[PDB]
Enzyme design. Structure first.
Site, PDB file in Angstrom:
ATOM      1  N   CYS A   1       0.802  -1.236   0.000  1.00  0.00           N
ATOM      2  CA  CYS A   1       0.000   0.000   0.000  1.00  0.00           C
ATOM      3  C   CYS A   1       0.831   1.280   0.000  1.00  0.00           C
ATOM      4  O   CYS A   1       1.623   1.527   0.919  1.00  0.00           O
ATOM      5  CB  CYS A   1      -0.947   0.036   1.198  1.00  0.00           C
ATOM      6  SG  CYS A   1      -1.936   1.548   1.271  1.00  0.00           S
TER       7      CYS A   1
ATOM      8  N   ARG B   1      -0.051   4.505   2.917  1.00  0.00           N
ATOM      9  CA  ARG B   1       0.067   4.266   4.354  1.00  0.00           C
ATOM     10  C   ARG B   1       0.363   5.481   5.247  1.00  0.00           C
ATOM     11  O   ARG B   1       0.318   5.353   6.468  1.00  0.00           O
ATOM     12  CB  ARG B   1       1.078   3.143   4.632  1.00  0.00           C
ATOM     13  CG  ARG B   1       0.562   1.742   4.304  1.00  0.00           C
ATOM     14  CD  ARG B   1       1.625   0.716   4.614  1.00  0.00           C
ATOM     15  NE  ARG B   1       2.594   0.607   3.525  1.00  0.00           N
ATOM     16  CZ  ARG B   1       3.779   0.020   3.649  1.00  0.00           C
ATOM     17  NH1 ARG B   1       4.149  -0.473   4.826  1.00  0.00           N
ATOM     18  NH2 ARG B   1       4.595  -0.056   2.599  1.00  0.00           N
TER      19      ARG B   1
ATOM     20  N   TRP C   1      -9.423   6.082  -0.509  1.00  0.00           N
ATOM     21  CA  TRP C   1      -9.840   6.687  -1.773  1.00  0.00           C
ATOM     22  C   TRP C   1      -8.926   6.136  -2.865  1.00  0.00           C
ATOM     23  O   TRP C   1      -7.881   5.561  -2.574  1.00  0.00           O
ATOM     24  CB  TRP C   1      -9.753   8.218  -1.718  1.00  0.00           C
ATOM     25  CG  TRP C   1      -8.427   8.710  -1.207  1.00  0.00           C
ATOM     26  CD1 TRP C   1      -7.250   8.787  -1.908  1.00  0.00           C
ATOM     27  CD2 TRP C   1      -8.145   9.194   0.108  1.00  0.00           C
ATOM     28  NE1 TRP C   1      -6.253   9.292  -1.102  1.00  0.00           N
ATOM     29  CE2 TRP C   1      -6.776   9.547   0.144  1.00  0.00           C
ATOM     30  CE3 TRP C   1      -8.915   9.355   1.271  1.00  0.00           C
ATOM     31  CZ2 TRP C   1      -6.159  10.044   1.290  1.00  0.00           C
ATOM     32  CZ3 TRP C   1      -8.308   9.863   2.412  1.00  0.00           C
ATOM     33  CH2 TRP C   1      -6.944  10.205   2.414  1.00  0.00           C
TER      34      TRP C   1
ATOM     35  N   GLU D   1      -5.188   3.344 -10.595  1.00  0.00           N
ATOM     36  CA  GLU D   1      -5.882   2.076 -10.365  1.00  0.00           C
ATOM     37  C   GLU D   1      -7.063   1.985 -11.309  1.00  0.00           C
ATOM     38  O   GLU D   1      -7.433   0.899 -11.768  1.00  0.00           O
ATOM     39  CB  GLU D   1      -6.374   1.974  -8.927  1.00  0.00           C
ATOM     40  CG  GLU D   1      -5.276   2.074  -7.892  1.00  0.00           C
ATOM     41  CD  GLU D   1      -5.814   1.910  -6.496  1.00  0.00           C
ATOM     42  OE1 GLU D   1      -6.058   0.749  -6.101  1.00  0.00           O
ATOM     43  OE2 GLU D   1      -6.019   2.934  -5.799  1.00  0.00           O
TER      44      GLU D   1
HETATM   45  C1  HEM Z   1      -6.397   6.388   1.880  1.00  0.00           C
HETATM   46  C2  HEM Z   1      -6.280   6.060   0.584  1.00  0.00           C
HETATM   47  C3  HEM Z   1      -5.542   4.872   0.078  1.00  0.00           C
HETATM   48  C4  HEM Z   1      -4.847   4.820  -1.084  1.00  0.00           C
HETATM   49  C5  HEM Z   1      -4.698   5.953  -2.072  1.00  0.00           C
HETATM   50  C6  HEM Z   1      -4.298   3.513  -1.218  1.00  0.00           C
HETATM   51  C7  HEM Z   1      -3.543   3.125  -2.325  1.00  0.00           C
HETATM   52  C8  HEM Z   1      -3.329   1.782  -2.599  1.00  0.00           C
HETATM   53  C9  HEM Z   1      -2.898   1.266  -3.846  1.00  0.00           C
HETATM   54  C10 HEM Z   1      -2.623   2.059  -5.100  1.00  0.00           C
HETATM   55  C11 HEM Z   1      -2.790  -0.080  -3.729  1.00  0.00           C
HETATM   56  C12 HEM Z   1      -2.305  -1.015  -4.805  1.00  0.00           C
HETATM   57  C13 HEM Z   1      -3.301  -1.795  -5.636  1.00  0.00           C
HETATM   58  C14 HEM Z   1      -2.560  -2.134  -6.917  1.00  0.00           C
HETATM   59  O1  HEM Z   1      -1.294  -2.123  -6.980  1.00  0.00           O
HETATM   60  O2  HEM Z   1      -3.221  -2.413  -7.941  1.00  0.00           O
HETATM   61  C15 HEM Z   1      -3.126  -0.416  -2.400  1.00  0.00           C
HETATM   62  C16 HEM Z   1      -3.079  -1.714  -1.950  1.00  0.00           C
HETATM   63  C17 HEM Z   1      -3.460  -1.978  -0.644  1.00  0.00           C
HETATM   64  N1  HEM Z   1      -3.911  -1.101   0.289  1.00  0.00           N
HETATM   65 FE1  HEM Z   1      -4.071   0.790   0.211  1.00  0.00          FE
HETATM   66  N2  HEM Z   1      -4.672   2.766  -0.179  1.00  0.00           N
HETATM   67  C18 HEM Z   1      -5.400   3.517   0.678  1.00  0.00           C
HETATM   68  C19 HEM Z   1      -6.020   3.156   1.886  1.00  0.00           C
HETATM   69  C20 HEM Z   1      -5.933   1.888   2.452  1.00  0.00           C
HETATM   70  C21 HEM Z   1      -6.543   1.463   3.648  1.00  0.00           C
HETATM   71  C22 HEM Z   1      -7.471   2.306   4.489  1.00  0.00           C
HETATM   72  C23 HEM Z   1      -6.135   0.149   3.897  1.00  0.00           C
HETATM   73  C24 HEM Z   1      -6.527  -0.734   5.023  1.00  0.00           C
HETATM   74  C25 HEM Z   1      -6.829  -0.330   6.269  1.00  0.00           C
HETATM   75  C26 HEM Z   1      -5.275  -0.217   2.813  1.00  0.00           C
HETATM   76  C27 HEM Z   1      -4.641  -1.425   2.655  1.00  0.00           C
HETATM   77  C28 HEM Z   1      -4.146  -1.827   1.406  1.00  0.00           C
HETATM   78  C29 HEM Z   1      -3.868  -3.247   1.155  1.00  0.00           C
HETATM   79  C30 HEM Z   1      -4.019  -4.391   2.122  1.00  0.00           C
HETATM   80  C31 HEM Z   1      -3.445  -3.353  -0.111  1.00  0.00           C
HETATM   81  C32 HEM Z   1      -3.038  -4.656  -0.788  1.00  0.00           C
HETATM   82  C33 HEM Z   1      -4.253  -5.344  -1.422  1.00  0.00           C
HETATM   83  C34 HEM Z   1      -3.885  -6.650  -2.100  1.00  0.00           C
HETATM   84  O3  HEM Z   1      -2.848  -7.285  -1.790  1.00  0.00           O
HETATM   85  O4  HEM Z   1      -4.636  -7.126  -2.981  1.00  0.00           O
HETATM   86  N3  HEM Z   1      -5.149   0.873   1.986  1.00  0.00           N
HETATM   87  N4  HEM Z   1      -3.435   0.744  -1.690  1.00  0.00           N
HETATM   88  C1  LIG Z   2      -8.248   0.111   0.471  1.00  0.00           C
HETATM   89  C2  LIG Z   2      -7.697   0.294  -0.920  1.00  0.00           C
HETATM   90  C3  LIG Z   2      -7.592   1.564  -1.476  1.00  0.00           C
HETATM   91  C4  LIG Z   2      -7.080   1.704  -2.769  1.00  0.00           C
HETATM   92  N1  LIG Z   2      -6.971   2.929  -3.348  1.00  0.00           N
HETATM   93  N2  LIG Z   2      -6.684   0.614  -3.472  1.00  0.00           N
HETATM   94  C5  LIG Z   2      -6.776  -0.631  -2.948  1.00  0.00           C
HETATM   95  C6  LIG Z   2      -6.322  -1.826  -3.768  1.00  0.00           C
HETATM   96  C7  LIG Z   2      -7.493  -2.275  -4.630  1.00  0.00           C
HETATM   97  C8  LIG Z   2      -7.210  -3.524  -5.447  1.00  0.00           C
HETATM   98  C9  LIG Z   2      -8.289  -4.369  -5.685  1.00  0.00           C
HETATM   99  C10 LIG Z   2      -8.115  -5.525  -6.432  1.00  0.00           C
HETATM  100  C11 LIG Z   2      -6.857  -5.855  -6.946  1.00  0.00           C
HETATM  101  C12 LIG Z   2      -6.774  -7.145  -7.740  1.00  0.00           C
HETATM  102  C13 LIG Z   2      -6.070  -8.257  -6.955  1.00  0.00           C
HETATM  103  C14 LIG Z   2      -6.366  -8.252  -5.458  1.00  0.00           C
HETATM  104  N3  LIG Z   2      -6.934  -9.551  -5.053  1.00  0.00           N
HETATM  105  C15 LIG Z   2      -5.760  -5.000  -6.735  1.00  0.00           C
HETATM  106  C16 LIG Z   2      -4.357  -5.286  -7.263  1.00  0.00           C
HETATM  107  C17 LIG Z   2      -4.180  -5.284  -8.786  1.00  0.00           C
HETATM  108  C18 LIG Z   2      -2.755  -5.599  -9.250  1.00  0.00           C
HETATM  109  C19 LIG Z   2      -2.594  -6.448 -10.345  1.00  0.00           C
HETATM  110  C20 LIG Z   2      -1.326  -6.766 -10.831  1.00  0.00           C
HETATM  111  C21 LIG Z   2      -1.178  -7.691 -12.020  1.00  0.00           C
HETATM  112  C22 LIG Z   2      -0.207  -6.224 -10.204  1.00  0.00           C
HETATM  113  C23 LIG Z   2      -0.394  -5.374  -9.118  1.00  0.00           C
HETATM  114  N4  LIG Z   2       0.705  -4.845  -8.526  1.00  0.00           N
HETATM  115  N5  LIG Z   2      -1.647  -5.068  -8.664  1.00  0.00           N
HETATM  116  C24 LIG Z   2      -5.949  -3.838  -5.969  1.00  0.00           C
HETATM  117  C25 LIG Z   2      -7.283  -0.813  -1.659  1.00  0.00           C
HETATM  118 CL   LIG Z   3     -10.226  -1.385  -7.843  1.00  0.00          CL
END
Ligand code: HEM
Ligand SMILES: Cc1cc(N)nc(CCc2ccc(CCCN)c(CCc3cc(C)cc(N)n3)c2)c1
Ligand SMILES: [Cl-]
Ligand code: HEM
Ligand SMILES: Cc1cc(N)nc(CCc2ccc(CCCN)c(CCc3cc(C)cc(N)n3)c2)c1
Ligand SMILES: [Cl-]
Lengths: 362, 362
Positions: free
Chosen positions: A65, A68, A237, A242
């Site tokens: 994330c 954070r 948000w 994304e």
């Molecule tokens: C406040 C705004 C937030 C932004 C802008 C943000 C941004 C992101 C982004 C861009 C990702 C990556 C998804 C990807 O690479 O496709 C992500 C993943 C993640 N975020 Fe955040 N996030 C936010 C809030 C949160 C909150 C509130 C939590 C939990 C309390 C959280 C926990 C995570 C987790 C666990 C992942 C990994 C999900 C996975 O492995 O599939 N985030 N976040």
């Molecule tokens: C809480 C929160 C806020 C925010 N802005 N973004 C997120 C992550 C959302 C999200 C939802 C679903 C997914 C799909 C897989 C997860 N089981 C992802 C990750 C997508 C992805 C795909 C690939 C190929 C690579 C990569 N780094 N990330 C990320 C969470």
């Molecule tokens: Cl999404």
């Protein structure tokens, strides 16, 4: 064994949590109480203070994330009191409403009763609380392909989608003791959506793209001091990429880059024209523009990375080790324009944290 | 110990190399010969066939290289006969000429005598055979900051740069037995450069950007069957992003994105305008356009990734394990638009290979 895992995890968490809360002196007594409770009942119950700080720590430890920096302002809603499906549905509706907050999104988590004997009390089927359905019948593709299997599962249970490209999936979850999950259509008044337009290119609206305001992840397990909260939906948000670089862009998602190229008036014929790159940039500009114009929180990847730099500094300043997954932290657009790209990160798992778990369908 | 390392590495290489060459039956006798030679002399000498195939294997095993599809067509020049600095200089001049090939670049490596007792016979100081100098005197920055330390070392030895933003560094190398390296100015007739213009935006030429045609890496060690070829410069052709997204774009290199933004007529004021992303795309289009227009080989990152996909399939089809560094294989522009982004790679080191070595200066 199973309970030794619990006690060891409880020991580490309570010590660490109470140090951060300036409550270090209460650790000894609290651990005695916990130890007796595991002895007498097989598990233990978190105080509300522990639950809130644990959920915050879990966010802080989420290697993937970029957002954070704001871990300590997470809005934690304690719903361990829930016993009925109406209560669950209503808690999920409420989470959507208070998190959306008329567009000024509040990072929020709702925490449901934890697993007992590895037995779930509440089992959420949705990947996100708000997501679009997907269909693939006889060569024709409609909606979000990533939702195909869940969509098929819903339609097994008597739901029927309108087969628009943006059908809102119903909430779907199962209660302990029930054989089948129940589903509830989302009230549209709860769900903010944003139509995608471009700041300069009027024709962009011809694509009739839109996306939902709030990503609410509802299929991960929150683990805190050996307690498994399998149902604990959380949201932030969006970071613009994304939506613009993945959800709407991926060939295995909405696959809109050729259509973007056409409306922005460039050819999509030669790799050397970098038409995909140019289309990605414009689509991503449109997404940011559209959310901002509507008053819905969103962050661009540059500002996000700047905030993450501050998270890094804050961690060092607080004497905490930093962990991160470089492969997820770099944005999928201009990654080398962020500081993240140019350093490395230790990808060790630290608890509390959020973890994947097996889907109850497919 | 040191010689047991050599024999073990020799064993693995000769077996593997000869299998690939359909020469499996000759392995036994060749290993006996090698074993005697290590016994009698402390080392062994590669046949020309071994040297060529080893250099090709080394390219094939380079985890960080997206261009590996063409590993088997590497042009290997055997210069183990070299004994004088004139011979080295002339071999380096020749490498530039034949690799450049009037713009139709030939992937080439020139191999110099290997280390003896870990004692170098030829020690090349350049990072690339063709590169621009860099200066930082009293706040003023000129040229390529990445070249600052080498540039300072050259100027210690009586070279003087014109302090243009694109001074060609001289060839600089040291011979065994000499205290100081020698330097030789590059004949400009040898060095193709490309002025950067944009296909649609006439004003882009106002930036007066250019880059050199051929990247010739001259500071890595080629290791083959326990033999250390510390001096073995090699080249391919550029992938456009290396120039447009890094060399000319990085804040710690030429740092041109604000100037690009101005000439393409967009504001550089707000992160949400994605002006850096848009400038990156246009600069990268200009680079591809400019090389193509001049008749100098170059590949865009989309075509490159497509070629790398074929390398992957070829490896599987040949029954060879694939290795790769995901963090280097993804292009720095639209990485999620390539297949590389969406899979994982085993980053194990397989030999023969190319390795970093300590700089003889700084
Ligand atoms: C406040 C705004 C937030 C932004 C802008 C943000 C941004 C992101 C982004 C861009 C990702 C990556 C998804 C990807 O690479 O496709 C992500 C993943 C993640 N975020 Fe955040 N996030 C936010 C809030 C949160 C909150 C509130 C939590 C939990 C309390 C959280 C926990 C995570 C987790 C666990 C992942 C990994 C999900 C996975 O492995 O599939 N985030 N976040
Ligand atoms: C809480 C929160 C806020 C925010 N802005 N973004 C997120 C992550 C959302 C999200 C939802 C679903 C997914 C799909 C897989 C997860 N089981 C992802 C990750 C997508 C992805 C795909 C690939 C190929 C690579 C990569 N780094 N990330 C990320 C969470
Ligand atoms: Cl999404
Ligand atoms: C034919 C055209 C070639 C192309 C387009 C190509 C492409 C690339 C690219 C883009 C990189 C990454 C640099 C970065 O991420 O900034 C790279 C790294 C590398 N390439 Fe290739 N390459 C080619 C030929 C070669 C040849 C001929 C060799 C050696 C025989 C080679 C060996 C390597 C090595 C060793 C690296 C890693 C360098 C390091 O770690 O610093 N490549 N290549
Ligand atoms: C033979 C060849 C052909 C070709 N097209 N490209 C290359 C790679 C050229 C090259 C030269 C210098 C360098 C600088 C460091 C190496 N000591 C690089 C790698 C640059 C880089 C930097 C960062 C921060 C990340 C990354 N993945 N890659 C890459 C070799
Ligand atoms: Cl380079």
């Amino acid at each position: 064994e199973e309970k030794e895992i619990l006690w060891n995890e409880a020991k580490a968490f309570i010590a660490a949590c109470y140090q951060e809360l300036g409550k270090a002196a209460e650790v000894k007594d609290r651990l005695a109480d916990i130890k007796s409770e595991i002895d007498l009942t097989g598990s233990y119950v978190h105080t509300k203070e522990e639950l809130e700080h644990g959920a915050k720590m879990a966010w802080r430890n989420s290697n993937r994330c970029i957002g954070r920096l704001f871990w300590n302002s997470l809005n934690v809603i304690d719903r361990r009191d829930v016993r009925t499906k109406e209560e669950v549905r209503d808690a999920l509706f409420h989470h959507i409403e208070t998190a959306t907050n008329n567009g000024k999104i509040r990072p929020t988590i709702t925490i449901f009763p934890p697993e007992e004997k590895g037995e779930k009390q509440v089992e959420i089927w949705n990947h996100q609380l708000i997501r679009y359905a997907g269909y693939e019948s006889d060569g024709e593709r409609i909606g979000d392909p990533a939702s195909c299997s869940l969509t098929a599962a819903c339609e097994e249970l008597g739901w029927r989608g309108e087969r628009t490209d943006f059908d809102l999936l119903p909430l779907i979850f199962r209660m302990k003791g029930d054989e089948q999950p129940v589903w509830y259509e989302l009230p549209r008044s709860l769900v903010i959506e944003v139509p995608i337009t471009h700041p300069d290119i009027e024709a962009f609206s011809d694509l009739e793209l839109k996306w939902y305001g709030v990503p609410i992840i509802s299929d991960m397990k929150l683990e805190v001091g050996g307690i498994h909260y399998n149902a604990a939906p959380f949201n932030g948000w969006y970071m613009g990429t994304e939506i613009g670089a993945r959800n709407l862009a991926d060939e295995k998602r909405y696959d809109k880059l050729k259509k973007v190229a056409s409306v922005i008036g460039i050819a999509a014929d030669y790799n050397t024209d970098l038409w995909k790159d140019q289309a990605l940039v414009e689509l991503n500009k449109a997404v940011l523009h559209s959310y901002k114009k509507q008053g819905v929180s969103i962050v661009d990847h540059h500002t996000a990375a700047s905030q993450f730099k501050r998270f890094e500094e804050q961690a060092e300043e607080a004497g905490r080790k930093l962990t991160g997954d470089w492969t997820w932290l770099i944005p999928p657009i201009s990654p080398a324009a962020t500081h993240i790209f140019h350093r490395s990160y230790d990808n060790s798992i630290v608890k509390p944290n959020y973890f994947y778990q097996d889907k109850p369908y497919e």
